[PDB]
Amino acid sequence: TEVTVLEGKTMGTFWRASIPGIDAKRSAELKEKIQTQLDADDQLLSTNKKDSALMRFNDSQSLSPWPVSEAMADIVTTSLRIGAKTDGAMDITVGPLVNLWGFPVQIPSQEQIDAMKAKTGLQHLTVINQSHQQYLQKDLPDLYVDLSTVGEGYAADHLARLMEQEGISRYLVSVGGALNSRGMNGEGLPWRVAIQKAVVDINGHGISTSGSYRNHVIDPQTGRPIEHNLVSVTVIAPTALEADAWDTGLMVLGPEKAKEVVRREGLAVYMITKEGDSFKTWMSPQFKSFLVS
Amino acid sequence: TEVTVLEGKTMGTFWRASIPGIDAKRSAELKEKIQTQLDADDQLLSTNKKDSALMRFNDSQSLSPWPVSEAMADIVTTSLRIGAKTDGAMDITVGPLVNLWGVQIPSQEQIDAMKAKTGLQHLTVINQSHQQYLQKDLPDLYVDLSTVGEGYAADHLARLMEQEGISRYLVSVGGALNSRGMNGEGLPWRVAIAVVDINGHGISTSGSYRNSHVIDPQTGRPIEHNLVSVTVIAPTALEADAWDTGLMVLGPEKAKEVVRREGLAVYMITKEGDSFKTWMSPQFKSFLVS
Ligand SMILES: Nc1ncnc2c1ncn2[C@@H]1O[C@H](COP(=O)(O)OP(=O)(O)O)[C@@H](O)[C@H]1O
Ligand SMILES: Nc1ncnc2c1ncn2[C@@H]1O[C@H](COP(=O)(O)OP(=O)(O)O)[C@@H](O)[C@H]1O
Ligand SMILES: [Mg+2]
Ligand SMILES: [Mg+2]
Ligand SMILES: [Mg+2]
Ligand SMILES: [Mg+2]
């Protein structure tokens, strides 16, 4: 079965969709639908866009409920929860600190860091869901929400839903470092995804890999760029949004604390760490269950 | 390639789990963990158990936020939204009307009276980083998650499989199923409805699995159209369960409009005089095996 691969730009990075058994006409039509949806998601979420739904909330000083879409509500909810579960390491309110670091020319003082830390905190954000509407609510006017670190994962999940709505049940889709697959590839086998150096089958799941994809990461506790020997983390989770959120959180925590969260939460994770000259690797038991022989 | 098949009781119905290739010690430990988790989900969601998390909320007359678990918040959020998207057909607040029909048939007057104690607009979910809440603006509101509890449990069982390093399985709770990977013959799990492969998806089939009435909230009466059966394939079994109930309540014509609009994978059976006829959405057909 011949596989069509579609590719384009979104959110400062790239997207891909591999779809077996679709003709040229259907391919062109789907590429248009895909790009249209991704552009919409970018318009929903981008901090690089002055007029995005999210930046409109960020510009607002209101402390009352601010209406948002179902997806916005869910992305924030997931981010808030995984934030708590990673001891605040994954923090969508860390924006003020990111800007402080030119995220780069001049290094901020601890005094400047402290001042900006006071404008952040996951405790300041609430999601309100009802049948016909939903809201974000902040209790700090200066709160700044940045969903950069989960936007690729959401986009990939949403691409998967689009495939389903289009009657496409076999696909591998990706946005930046986030991927989702379902069903069989061209050769009637579960989609294979290669990992930074092994191969996994993550059908029915999302996977996210650390790194910079747009054209960075700050420890919310210290208000400084991250350190540690953890050079790469890969998370497999039920959705790519979740995988993205865990991935960033774990990357911030570093090897020792990350493993503690991984163990407690029963996460499927693969880490590459640097030990002097060379590197060592670590996989949770849950991660190994996804490996293909 | 041998398949362990586990089975037990939960939520007034039965759960099932097919797992390829594991020894008896594993099968034994899993059964214990599965039953333990399903028991906890029942303690969370059951309208029978007077002391369930859900019944404690129902028992309260407070109109202020009531703390619940993440699962509870998410189940309710999904239920509220799919309720809206099925024009109120799927309605977790319909309990007062259900109880009314539990003696003698109520009049339309008695029905209209109880309608006043219902409405999806009365329920709010509040999510924060370290806690989350349900909130009702009507003390007498009664929440019943019977129609989604099976789907949630099947999804949660899938999460249990994953946390337990199991990559190939078919789990079911009542009419709700999830599957992943290859069965005891290297082929994707086959689900009889026509047969489908729904690996990586939830599926729910209409019907009674507990040991009652499905009420049309618009009329406040038992449903009485010619939609014999509806099956939904969705990203999760919770969603499938919720859609399935909504579309069953809506009946054939209205259900098809929702299915078209929302792009759902749905299979319907309707009664045409003496014979039946079938209908599949384009999306459902992508799951058919031959
Ligand atoms: N600790 C954090 N938690 C959540 N978001 C963060 C954190 N630190 C930085 N960010 C945001 O995430 C971005 C990095 O996102 P990522 O997708 O990993 O790389 P990039 O966006 O540079 O491709 C930063 O530019 C910043 O907007
Ligand atoms: N329209 C509705 N929306 C949501 N729940 C309903 C509705 N009508 C009835 N219910 C509740 O759902 C139950 C039916 O659930 P279901 O799983 O479809 O069948 P059963 O519980 O009989 O196996 C009823 O007993 C009642 O508690
Ligand atoms: Mg990136
Ligand atoms: Mg990320
Ligand atoms: Mg049932
Ligand atoms: Mg149902």
Author numbering:
A (entry chain B): 13 to 115, 121 to 214, 224 to 241, 252 to 329
B (entry chain A): 13 to 114, 122 to 212, 224 to 241, 251 to 329
Which sentences did the original study use to describe this structure?
John Wiley & Sons, LtdAs the Ftp_EcY60N protein variant displays FAD pyrophosphatase activity that is inhibited by ADP, we obtained a crystal structure of the ADP complex with two metals bound. This structure provides the best model to date of the bimetal coordination of the ADP portion of an FAD substrate to this subclass of FMN transferases. In contrast to the apo structures, there are only two monomers in the asymmetric unit, and the r.m.s.d. of the monomers is 0.4 Å for 289 Cα carbons. The metal ion in site 1 in both monomers is no longer coordinated to a carboxylate oxygen atom from the side chain of D283, and thus has a coordination number of 6. Refinement of the metals as Ca2+ ions resulted in large negative electron density peaks that disappeared when modeled and refined as Mg2+ ions. Unlike the Ftp_Tp ADP‐inhibited structure, the α‐phosphate oxygens of the ADP do not coordinate to the metal ion in site 1. Coordinated to a second Mg2+ ion are α‐ and β‐phosphate oxygens of the ADP, as well as the side chain of E169. The side chain of R240 also coordinates to the β‐phosphate of the ADP. The distance between metal sites in this structure is over 6 Å, approximately twice the distance observed in the various Ftp_Tp inhibitor and substrate complexes, and we observed no metal‐coordinated water that can effectively bridge between the bimetal sites. Despite the presence of a Ca2+ ion in metal site 1 in the apo enzyme, the inhibited Ftp_EcY60N protein variant enzyme contains a bimetal Mg2+ center.
